[PDB]
Short mmCIF file of N, CA and C in Angstrom, two decimals:
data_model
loop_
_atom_site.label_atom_id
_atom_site.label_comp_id
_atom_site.label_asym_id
_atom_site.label_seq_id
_atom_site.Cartn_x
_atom_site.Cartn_y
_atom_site.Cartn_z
N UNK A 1 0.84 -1.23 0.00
CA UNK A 1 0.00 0.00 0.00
C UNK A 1 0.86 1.26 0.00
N UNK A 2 0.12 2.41 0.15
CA UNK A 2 1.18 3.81 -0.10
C UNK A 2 0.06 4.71 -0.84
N UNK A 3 -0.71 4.45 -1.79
CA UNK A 3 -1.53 5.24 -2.72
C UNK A 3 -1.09 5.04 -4.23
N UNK A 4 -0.94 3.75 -4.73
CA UNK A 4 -0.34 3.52 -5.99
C UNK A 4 -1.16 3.49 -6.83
N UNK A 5 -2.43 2.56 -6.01
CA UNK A 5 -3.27 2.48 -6.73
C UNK A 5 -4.47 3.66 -7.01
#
């Protein structure tokens, strides 16, 4: 996760 998607 992180906001990659």
């Amino acid at each position: 996760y992180g906001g990659f998607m």
